Amino acid sequence: RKDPFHLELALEYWCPTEPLQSTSLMGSFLGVAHQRPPQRQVLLSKFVRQMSDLLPATLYLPYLKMLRGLASGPQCAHYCFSLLKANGGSSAENLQAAGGSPVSWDHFFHSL
């Protein structure tokens, strides 16, 4: 919920799906294309995704509070935004199956 020492330790729960094209730190001469994310970070990001899949009504509030804690920090917030955006995109053409994830931007703003 708070990162007073800017340690960014919440990043271990997030796996980048796209390389951020930030062209603005031209200043360290170590070309290393494509490290696979560490096996630890893959397991923790799989845990966050697994906890969203078929979420029971009893775990809804705890899961949103977990995501709120994991969304503290600039990169963490952007990955959480991308996760909630990805959860909405899978059903625009069949209006008669209420099969959208309850943890999505579409569900939050449509409910409001």
């Binding site: 799906t17 390389p19 094209q21």
Partner: protein
């Protein structure tokens, strides 16, 4: 046919690709093409150059139509299987090579034949898809055949080129861009701020 299969395999493993292209193959031409196509279908697209070999093999015999078809199949499979910056670059090059081959053909014959998107290419040697009851599902006996004209190939080329421009601007987007429809691609280009490429894509589609 079994000796021909062995010859094609051993020459491909020895990298003696010139001899394989120059041989006359009197009456065996369709079988060589079928063997190399079957291997090009079975092998990984990034490790072995069998599509580039099939293309060289058809260009040498002035078969520009089949050369275009093979490079188009290569570009389609790269878009499905290889969602990397290098895969997208090879896909744009294969569609460009296809367009160049069809421009060498008279306009009346400048069309490629595709099985419709959703024709299960059963991998030759996949166990028959059994239903829950263990019966062989009857092969759906209509592979609907789509005829692609030069204008539809130009749309697919522009779509692959726009996917590559987005992936070059942001390497993290290469996985998403590889599957994006023309409409989703407009939304992604607009998020990146590549408005002229989005306008060009809106005009083409």
């Amino acid at each position: 046919l079994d000796c021909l299969r062995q010859l094609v395999v051993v020459l491909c493993e020895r990298s003696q690709l010139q001899d394989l292209v120059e041989f006359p193959y009197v009456n065996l031409h369709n079988e060589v093409v079928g063997i190399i196509e079957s291997r090009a279908r079975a092998v990984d697209l990034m490790t072995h150059n069998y599509y580039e070999l099939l293309y060289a093999f058809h260009i040498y015999r002035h078969n520009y139509r089949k050369a275009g078809s093979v490079m188009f199949e290569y570009g389609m499979r790269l878009g499905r299987e290889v969602r990397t910056l290098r895969g997208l670059q090879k896909q744009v090059n294969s569609y460009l090579a296809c367009l160049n081959c069809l421009r060498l053909i008279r306009p009346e014959y400048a069309w490629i034949v595709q099985p419709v998107s959703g024709a299960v290419y059963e991998r030759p040697g996949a166990s028959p898809k059994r239903n829950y009851d263990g019966e062989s599902s009857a092969v759906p006996s209509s592979s609907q055949i789509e005829i692609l004209e030069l204008r539809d190939l130009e749309k697919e080329y522009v779509l692959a080129q726009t996917r590559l421009t987005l992936a070059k601007h942001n390497p993290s987007t290469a996985a998403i861009a590889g599957s994006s429809a023309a409409e989703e691609m407009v939304a992604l280009l607009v998020q990146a701020g590549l408005f002229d490429t989005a306008i060009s894509l809106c005009q083409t589609f």
